[PDB]
Amino acid sequence: RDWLPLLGMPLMLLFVQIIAIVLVMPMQAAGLVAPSSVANPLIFIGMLLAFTLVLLVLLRTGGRRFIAAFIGFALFMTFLYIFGALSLLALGPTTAAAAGTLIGAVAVTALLYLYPEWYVIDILGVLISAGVASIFGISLEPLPVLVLLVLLAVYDAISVYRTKHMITLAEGVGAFVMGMGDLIMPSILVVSSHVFLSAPTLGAMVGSLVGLAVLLYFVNKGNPQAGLPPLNGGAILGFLVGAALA
Amino acid sequence: RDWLPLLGMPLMLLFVQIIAIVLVMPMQAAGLVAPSSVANPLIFIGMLLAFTLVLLVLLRTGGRRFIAAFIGFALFMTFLYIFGALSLLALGPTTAAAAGTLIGAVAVTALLYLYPEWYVIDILGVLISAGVASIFGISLEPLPVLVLLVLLAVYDAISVYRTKHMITLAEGVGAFVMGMGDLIMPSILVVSSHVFLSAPTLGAMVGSLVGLAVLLYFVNKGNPQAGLPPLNGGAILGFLVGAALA
Amino acid sequence: RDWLPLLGMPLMLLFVQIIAIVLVMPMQAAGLVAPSSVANPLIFIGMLLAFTLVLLVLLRTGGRRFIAAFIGFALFMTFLYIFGALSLLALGPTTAAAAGTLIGAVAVTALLYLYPEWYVIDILGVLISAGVASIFGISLEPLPVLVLLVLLAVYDAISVYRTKHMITLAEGVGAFVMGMGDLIMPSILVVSSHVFLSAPTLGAMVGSLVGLAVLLYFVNKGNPQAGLPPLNGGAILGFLVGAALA
Amino acid sequence: RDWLPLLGMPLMLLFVQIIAIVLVMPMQAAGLVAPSSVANPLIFIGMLLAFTLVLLVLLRTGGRRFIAAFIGFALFMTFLYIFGALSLLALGPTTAAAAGTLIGAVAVTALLYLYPEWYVIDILGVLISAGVASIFGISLEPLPVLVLLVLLAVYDAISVYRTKHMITLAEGVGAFVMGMGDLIMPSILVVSSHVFLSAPTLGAMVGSLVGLAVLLYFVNKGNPQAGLPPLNGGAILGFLVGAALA
């Protein structure tokens, strides 16, 4: 039946979550994060709009390959923190370890750039996504991340409703970034909870999976829905279910 | 009779001033402002032109929905300060108060983005306007504000004459920003005066209203007029009338 | 003979120099400058390319009168330092003096914007030009400024020659800014020399006048010349003549 | 016979290396560089993509002569450091030396702007190239630079292959910067090796020439190759050949 089709996505959810925890571990070996303040979601948001603004002024200042340069660089560095953390905790500070990581990132990005096999892409998308998930996950505690999630989810429902309405008005009345990006979003909370075989924040993971469930159901029906609020609403739900648990 | 039409604006003036005072109160619970030096107005102007300059490089770096993002965010935080002060006066530093404000701000902006009832808009315009009015009102004392006000009103009448003249030459010889913005302008002197049932800077308020009166008359006659100098000139008139009182 | 015609420019030279000295004075009442290091010309230049880059990115980000705004601000402030220096030297720190300056600058610029008599333009152009002349003039001593004059003059001879050639190849083989700007240029050395009835840097003034003589001669002949190097070469000449004097 | 024609390039390589050493010397007279950590290369790359980003936003902000101004200027200072080092090693700290370099730099750039003899251009290309070569050679040690070189050569071969692919796909299935720039590249490992009758990094020099040989072969055939990796791979080859020697 409908097993193998359209399950690869929540497969990627589970996967990215898993790799996000296993990435919880090695990162304190160098600190990271960035104080369980309620202002932190806001620092996040501000720095994100500046991040896009930068990305956009880049795009419009391309740069036939200079764009491809800049983003190749940024990717390479993020893989160097992934693999860096990995080996340099494992073999520890050894040259074997460090060179191991550099050579690692080199392999990965070089592959991703040479037109891979592009089932690979969902794999590296899974990896990076996990990476960021863990970073902001080690950074500060739930209630802040909760404010962030609710905030972002409402932003989404608003923008969706707006351009949907602007669809109905116009008569007479690469997506992967925002993708695997939104794959991460409600998982930064799954980390920052086990950072506050696992916790009762298994609950958050399954509630989240149920959010994606709702999404891939309703989207697969005619005339689409919002996006975040199913995911964040669902993850938050299952999470607060593992509250009435312990 | 002709009561209800075109009385909503002085309704908004009074309202904006009033809410600017009632917000004078709770704001000291967190300070804000910014020394009654006259160097403050120039710091002010410098910072305003830098702010718009940025707002516009945003505008041209749009951003199909990114623009609306950036400024929507700005709106949300500014409501977070409105309601933040609101609650943090009432129940004081309690968490209940703080969450109350955050959810307050979500309520307001989420509403404003979902196409409200749009007598709503003038209400929130009244609100924000009052907000800024109170802040710079708490920022420094009369004589600085007097210089600032005379200066601004003068810029206005000047550019009006320049581009008007440039209309009469060409033969052969979004508005809400400047709106509720200038709706604010002559009210900052109304606060910073009660900071220097009320003071004799009622005079400033009604003088301001007489400015608004003059404006709304001449505009309502053929061949329109300047804008600020009736409002600021009038407010200054009544304020400096409130010297012969106490 | 041709005395009254085409002498108004060297008239403006003398005048700007005169007003540059009389502005040497009140300016030390607050310090200013910006160490007789030879690195200073370079700081100047970098800051000038930034000054333009900003001015130009402004222009292209106009700003129907917003451009006129930004530059209105910058001007207003420069007149506030002119008049500020003037009165706040005269009556000293008195309220009478300071208000005297603000009202002064207001009068002057507001005049300049309401379509004055525009011989005024050469007068205020003379004033401002003098202002900056003195500012960098008090800023550091000769040998640095000597390097500056030579540097700028050679930049000029290159750029003019380059575009001359680009004219001659192209067959088959608002100006006031750079204007009164280039009027100042060789007088900043006339100040920073008397800052190290007057000195023998009368010499610089007359040498400068002779540079302008060569300029208005060759320019009034077919196929123009550089611009600076007659003036800076000349001012530096006459200046180094006031060396064999004392 | 065919001696004189087309031997000038490895001439410029060898030459640039030679002048890179002779300029290694005087440069320590003021320090320069920038800790043989491998964190240095990514700092580097980060900084280059940022620099280019700047060069390009300059480019879009032209600027009829403003561009040529900016970069001519930059050149001028870089010559100020070339010659600064030249004399200040030679004549030492004397004023005579310092002025000598400044006037030198003026002469050089002024020439370079007046359309030289263009065997001359290759001469100044050689000069500048040697300059930077010596700097990053003095900047940190081999193993970092090794990482840098391998990394860069890899970017190159990859982007070339990418746009090649995009050529063969489109059917149916200013250059001097990148030039003398990459001419420099494999000479920085040659310096930073002597900073770690000559070294066994003659091997690196001739290895570089053998790289240049390989390159100059494949390019001279139809359908070009990568570029860097013959040069860097070869330089690294000859260099790491100098290990079984000393």
DSSP characters over B97-142: HHHHHHHHHHHHHHHHHS---SSHHHHHHHHHHHHHHHHHHHSSPH
Cβ–Cβ below 8 Å for B106 and A151? yes
Closest CA to B176 of B236, B229, B123, B113: B123
Do C and A count as touching (3 or more CB pairs closer than 8 A)? no
Distant-in-sequence contacts of B239-244, Cβ < 8 A, 24+ apart: B239/B142, B239/B189, B239/B190, B239/B193, B239/B201, B239/B203, B239/B204, B239/B207, B240/B203, B241/B203, B241/B207, B242/B193, B242/B199, B242/B200, B242/B201, B242/B202, B242/B203, B242/B204, B243/B200
Which residues are within 8 A (CB) of D48 and not within 5 positions of it... i.e. 6 or more apart?
A: none
Cβ–Cβ below 8 Å for A154 and B69? no
Dihedral of alpha carbons C155, C157, C159, C160, sign: positive
Q: How far apart are CA C152 and CA C136, in angstroms?
A: 15
Which residues does a gap of C–N over 2.5 Å follow in chain C? Answer: 34, 173, 196
By Cβ distance, the residue of D42, D53, D158 closest to A110 is D158
Optimal mutation site among A56, A59, A65, A88, interface D, most CBs of chain D within 10 A? A65
Which residues are within 8 A (CB) of A145 and not within 5 positions of it... i.e. 6 or more apart?
A: A41, A136, A188, A189, A192
Q: How close does chain B come to C18, measured CA to CA in Å?
A: 30
A194: tokens are 């086990």
Q: How close does chain B come to C238, measured CA to CA in Å?
A: 42
Closest CA to D44 of D146, D112, D166: D146
Helix axes A176-194, A120-138, angle to 10 degrees: 40
D8: tokens are 């000038």
C187: tokens are 């007088």
Helices (H) and strands (E) in chain C, counts: 11, 0
Coil, helix or strand for B43?
Answer: helix
Q: How far apart are CA A20 and CA A193, in angstroms?
A: 12
Cβ–Cβ below 8 Å for A52 and B66? yes
Q: How far apart are CA D132 and CA C167, in angstroms?
A: 36
Backbone angles phi, psi at C92, to 5 degrees: 70, -175
Closest CA to D144 of B14, A99, B175: A99
CA distances from C94 to B213, C99, C161, D220 (A): 38, 9, 53, 81
Q: How far apart are CA D15 and CA D190, in angstroms?
A: 13
By Cβ distance, the residue of C45, C57, C162 closest to D73 is C45
Among chain D, residues having any CB pair with chain A shorter than 8 Å are 38, 42, 45-46, 49, 52-53, 56-57, 60, 147, 151, 154-155, 158-159, 161-163, 165
C49: which chain D residues are within 8 Å (Cβ-Cβ)?
Answer: 66, 69-70, 73
A73: which chain D residues are within 8 Å (Cβ-Cβ)?
Answer: 45-46, 49
CB D218 within 8 A of CB D224: yes
Cβ–Cβ below 8 Å for C110 and B154? yes
Backbone angles phi, psi at A51, to 5 degrees: -60, -50
By Cβ distance, the residue of D70, D102, D114 closest to C49 is D70
Do B and C count as touching (3 or more CB pairs closer than 8 A)? yes
Coil, helix or strand for A4?
Answer: coil
What is the number of alpha carbons within 13 Å of residue C180 lying toward its C-beta? 22
Cβ–Cβ below 8 Å for D113 and C162? yes
Helix axes C142-168, C40-60, angle to 10 degrees: 50
Q: How close does chain C come to D67, measured CA to CA in Å?
A: 10
Elucidated via:
X-ray
CB atoms within 10 A of CB A54: 12
Coil, helix or strand for C2?
Answer: coil
Closest CA to B137 of B185, B183, B182, B207: B185
Residue C185 is given by DSSP the state G
Compute the C-alpha angle A129/A135/A140, nearest 5°. Answer: 130
Q: How far apart are CA B20 and CA A204, in angstroms?
A: 44
Which residues are within 8 A (CB) of C204 and not within 5 positions of it... i.e. 6 or more apart?
A: C189, C190, C193, C235, C236, C238, C239, C242
Optimal mutation site among C158, C161, C173, interface D, most CBs of chain D within 10 A? C158
Q: How far apart are CA C149 and CA C133, in angstroms?
A: 13
C115: which chain B residues are within 8 Å (Cβ-Cβ)?
Answer: 165
Residue C197 is given by DSSP the state -
> Which chains does B contact via 3+ CB–CB distances below 8 A?
A, C
Closest CA to A87 of A102, A70, A77: A102
> Which chains does D contact via 3+ CB–CB distances below 8 A?
A, C
CA B8 to chain centre: 16
Coil, helix or strand for A70?
Answer: helix
Optimal mutation site among C58, C59, C65, interface B, most CBs of chain B within 10 A? C65
Residue C81 is given by DSSP the state H
Q: How far apart are CA C72 and CA D208, in angstroms?
A: 59
Dihedral of alpha carbons B161, B163, B168, B173, sign: positive
Peptide bond into A131 cis (omega under 30): no
By Cβ distance, the residue of C63, C73, C106 closest to B46 is C73
